[PDB]
């Protein structure tokens, strides 16, 4: 398997990616540590894993999987690690290197959360979890308009602190791209000072019915 706890990802559309959006793909695979764009290598960034088996797992998922009309080329950095050096601000503000190591939203911080992963190929389908527990589809059609992303066709909420489900896209593209948009949006949480952070994944389910 891979030598190296980096990736480098090519085929990003620079005008709808950063650091927490590639964070909210690659999060799926391994703990995120590092994520770096480069201004001389547009489209592409350099997402250190925690070791070479999230890198391992997340080539063999998300490699030439299309993303807003663009193929992803994922494939092992010859960098071993991925140095602060000269950073700069994206069009969104945002800087073009983030440090995740620290992050509460990483889920293979141990051996016994990292097992509760269930890790699959990409899908139209995503499984949602820790959503406010009166969560509606129209709670999630309006997120989506805010983000300005695809509706789900589909939403499913399981029978249960917060609730878990299904959201159904057209195509594993539709929910790909919504999954980096989506995935740890703040949901409104009325019964307490925190939102919801909204977490996503992909799902075997046929449907969200």
Sequence with gaps: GADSPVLMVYGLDQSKMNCDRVFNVFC???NVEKVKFMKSKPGAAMVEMADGYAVDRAITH?????????????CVSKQPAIMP?????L???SCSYKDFSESRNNRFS?????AKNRIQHPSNVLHFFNAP?????????????ELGVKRPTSVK???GRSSSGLLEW???????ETLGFLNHYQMKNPNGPYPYTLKLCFSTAQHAS
């Excluded at 998300?62 to 994922?74: A, D, H, I, P, S």
């Excluded at 050096?85 to 601000?89: A, L």
């Excluded at 141990?110 to 990292?114: F, G, L, M, S, V």
């Excluded at 057209?170 to 790909?176: R, Y």
């Design 62 to 74: 998300l490699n030439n999987n299309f993303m807003f009309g663009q193929k992803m080329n994922v």
């Design 133 to 145: 527990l009166e969560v509606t589809e129209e709670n999630f059609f309006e997120i989506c308009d």
């Design 85 to 89: 050096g000269q950073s700069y601000g």
């Design 170 to 176: 057209d195509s594993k593209s539709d929910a790909l």
């Design 110 to 114: 141990t051996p016994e959360q990292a």
């Design 157 to 159: 909420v399981f029978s």
């Design 91 to 93: 069009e969104d503000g």
């Design 28 to 30: 799926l695979y391994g």
